[PDB]
Amino acid sequence: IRRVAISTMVQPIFSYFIMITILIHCIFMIMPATQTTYILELVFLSIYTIEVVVKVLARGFILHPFAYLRDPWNWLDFLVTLIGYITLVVLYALRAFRVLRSWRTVTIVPGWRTIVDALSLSITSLKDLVLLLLFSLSVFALIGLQLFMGNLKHKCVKHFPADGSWGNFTDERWFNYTSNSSHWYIPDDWIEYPLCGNSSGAGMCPPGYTCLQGYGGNPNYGYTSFDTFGWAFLSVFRLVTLDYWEDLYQLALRSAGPWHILFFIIVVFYGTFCFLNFILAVVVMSYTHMVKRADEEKVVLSPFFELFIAVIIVLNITFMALDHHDMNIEFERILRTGNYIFTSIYIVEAVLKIIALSPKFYFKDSWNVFDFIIVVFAILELGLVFRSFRLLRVFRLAKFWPTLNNFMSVMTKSYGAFVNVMYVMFLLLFIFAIIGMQLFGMNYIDNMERFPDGDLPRWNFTDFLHSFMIVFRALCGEWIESMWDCMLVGDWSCIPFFVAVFFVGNLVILNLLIALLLNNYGWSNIRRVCFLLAKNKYFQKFVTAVLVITSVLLALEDIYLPQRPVLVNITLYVDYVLTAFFVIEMIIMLFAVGFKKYFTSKWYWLDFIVVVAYLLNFVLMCAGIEALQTLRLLRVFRLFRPLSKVNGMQVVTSTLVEAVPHIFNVILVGIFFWLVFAIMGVQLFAGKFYKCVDENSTVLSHEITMDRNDCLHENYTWENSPMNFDHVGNAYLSLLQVATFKGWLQIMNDAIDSREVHKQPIRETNIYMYLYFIFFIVFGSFFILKLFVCILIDIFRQQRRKAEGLSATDSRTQLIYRRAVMRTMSAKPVKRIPKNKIQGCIFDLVTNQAFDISIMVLICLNMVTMMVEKEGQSQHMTEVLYWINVVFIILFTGECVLKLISLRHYYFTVGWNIFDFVVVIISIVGMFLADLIETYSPTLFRVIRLARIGRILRLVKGAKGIRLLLLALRKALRTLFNVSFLLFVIMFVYAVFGMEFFMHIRDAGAIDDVYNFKTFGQSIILLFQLATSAGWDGVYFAIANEEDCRAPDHELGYPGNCGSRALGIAYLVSYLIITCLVVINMYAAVILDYVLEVYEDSKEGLTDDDYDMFFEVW
């Protein structure tokens, strides 16, 4: 028995048989259930029970150190088997988790131990992060609850008619009229009522309407609001994750006023740019530790011929990229003839290499066999669809391109780790897809009526393909909208599902992929006086002040400027003065540094360009020609030199300057890969996004209009989608939209509906085209776009070493020891004298630990009391809460008074005591003045009452892990501020230029009455939104329009309302590259460096707390 049990278990055939059974079961889970699937379920269950029985007989159940149930994997198998028995012998929800067994398959891929251990270690080390996350989210939720309670219910209600149609006015007749939903303003074809508010800059009502509150529901089926603490918590989490956050941003600002942008700036800065980077750092350290442990464990054959082939390949790629939709016959002929020629040259090349070089030698080389495969593919394609394989030719460019060659070599060196990570990602997605299918599949069918038109949404859980796609979209970072649909047809269970999917997929697996990439990819008198003046500090300060003031003046040139003649005169005179000032400054600098030194530096070249532009404007004005706004806007570029000289700014600017070349290389490689995908997409979807629409832009059924001819016969419109794959340029723009996950849903919808050219698209007739996007996203977004952050992380590490004076040749341990040695020097103790008998007794009582624990409990209770407030609460509830808070204030004041008596003048030696003292004073004063302030603006009352939250911030005091993380943040504050300062300056430059370019465009897409480029503030609102790439497709659609817009009339002074496609493309693409992909990623770099240092101090060295403990006994 035992002999047989042990012997059978140890056989590899046993494990292989079980694993193959699991894989077959996985296949059967995908297809819809039938009777055959049922009998298969019994067979599979029997095999699993056999395995469990054998293992128990060999080891034993639990009672010995090496028993069956002493292994976590055995625990998983045991639980799944029991649940299968429960579901067969006797709720439908428990049977989904059978799929969990598939996790075992991760052991097939060699090297899985490293990745699995890295995942487990990352999960274990996120303990200290989760508590700080929950605390910060709750604080932000309370702030938002105080700020926006009930704001999302604002609506424009028609005035009570004065004609008497509804009857003579009465209070209840007025309430009846206003409560009717048919009197709330909503544009035709809209789903949501627009928001409003009477604060300056908020949404306005049409004539005959008034902005009221407390009517109807909140946006998004009522799931988006700040009315209760729970909903506020959900909104704050969404905002921190940047999940469709521009919608909430726009709703809140339209309802409350533009100033509330401040709230969003804080949450985004602290939540997104700092905390998520803490998670990234923790994952990176986990992976690095695991890899360290694993590693420690342990004619033709002439250059000219090659050059000729290289140019032939380049020409061939150009020809392949010139294919487009509706080509003329001449273009077709040229492209086909070139293809024939290129194929002939390749064939001749192959034969020549086989003759000059030995066939054995030829086929010994890898590049040669690749070329031969291309040759046979070309012959097969021309003989007889195999045109897709033509793309292989492009990869031949890697041989002659050193950068691409090196990139591919690095990819090949450590492929096993990438295979493991991708397999884990796909297995997790598969498990979640099966679970969600079982949990929510029938809800969509049964409760279809609840959807807006009673129609099934594109994204759902009906079948395996849709479930996989929806969970994959969640992993990409979009989860809240799917969760809204799930709740709409389902229940609360949707919330834990999606959140889990977002947490594991995006914050761990994707960050682990980043860690992998990081680990792998990484007269004499005149001269004298001019020189003395130039080197003088006062002169430089005066120049900087002039530049700053004039740049600030540039911001006042908004749409209303013509209505302010005084401002017009001030601007013109300042222009003249600036022209003179620039000329004089240039002469002085030339006299000081000389011609060679002046004309060999980049900063002086920028100054010179500004001078030349202003002189050109001067002559134009003299001649009677209107000044060029673009030229006179060039002076803002003078702002970067003083900015670069700001304290602590050197590290940031030096890092960016050093990273520039690597960024260029990454962009080139990305352009190549995106070209491959763009050619493929043009071949797949060129000319297939046309559809038939009527007077209202609504797509007709394929039944009424089968194709274009019917569409035109009924006098319908055959229209193209704005984003398409008609030619390579359009494909590039569409792929940029796909990679950033902004506007991608429309593109994918058009793709999966596509049919043959000149045929009405049908819903989901080509579903498998989803695959094309998946691949692109994996190789274009998860791999290529993440190289920028790796580059910045490495370069900032080097530059910060430079700034502190550290040596590049020193090792990690030496720096740990050097830091310890530096710390040991500075340390001084102190003692407090016990009090006199009564004062001394109080001293002992307060100095006890139980006192502080009690205070912490009181802080938690006060926080809960704050969490109870909700919109529409009763007045009695309001009074009760006020009195509870008063009692808490009295207790805290007593604690402070007792500490003051106990510690006398020593009380103020500790900073936390000063914070607590200030909080106590604020609390007393507010408790006294609450009614006076409220009775004698509601917005002002809410904002000032925010100070009440100060006395729950004392909860962080006393913790350990939170203290360590906060120490890292405090150590990095200067650099984070400098990065933000640079970001704001870039935003300012873009704001003035965007105001010049797009201030008169017509309302379309994301541009409307409230959000536009008409003023500096509105431009900044939009640009802050776009710094995260949020909603850049809608802005592009607004600013790039050139259709159905009237041209400017100089004679009549009409400015025009037309957009510009080229200008909009340049503007938005450059902004996305500069901010989203570079400057923002500096945050990650900074955070990672500092966090790592602190952790290495705590683990492999000494920390300040260690010295404090040593001096505690001293």
Ligand SMILES: CC(C)CCC[C@@H](C)[C@H]1CC[C@H]2[C@@H]3CC=C4C[C@@H](OC(=O)CCC(=O)O)CC[C@]4(C)[C@H]3CC[C@]12C
């Ligand atoms: C140095 C870094 C770390 C911080 C940069 C400071 C910003 C927070 C400041 C700079 C410019 C400010 C903006 C300047 C102009 C406006 C317009 C203002 O709204 C109005 O124009 C009110 C009048 C109306 O809406 O009718 C709202 C504040 C806002 C967006 C300001 C919000 C705060 C901003 C972004």
Ligand SMILES: C[C@@H](c1cc(Cl)cc(Cl)c1)N1CCC(COc2cc(F)c(C(=O)NS(C)(=O)=O)cc2C2CC2)CC1
């Ligand atoms: C400068 C002075 C000042 C300002 C001005 Cl403009 C005029 C004067 Cl004369 C004085 N500030 C200082 C800050 C104060 C902050 O405000 C609160 C503080 C609170 F702790 C509570 C509270 O705890 N509430 S509770 C019991 O929990 O319900 C509530 C409030 C708000 C006021 C209701 C307000 C007074």
Ligand SMILES: *[C@@H]1O[C@H](CO)[C@@H](O)[C@H](O)[C@H]1NC(C)=O
């Ligand atoms: C709202 O007003 C319309 C028109 O007067 C009326 O038909 C409708 O019944 C009203 N709504 C309710 C809920 O009575």
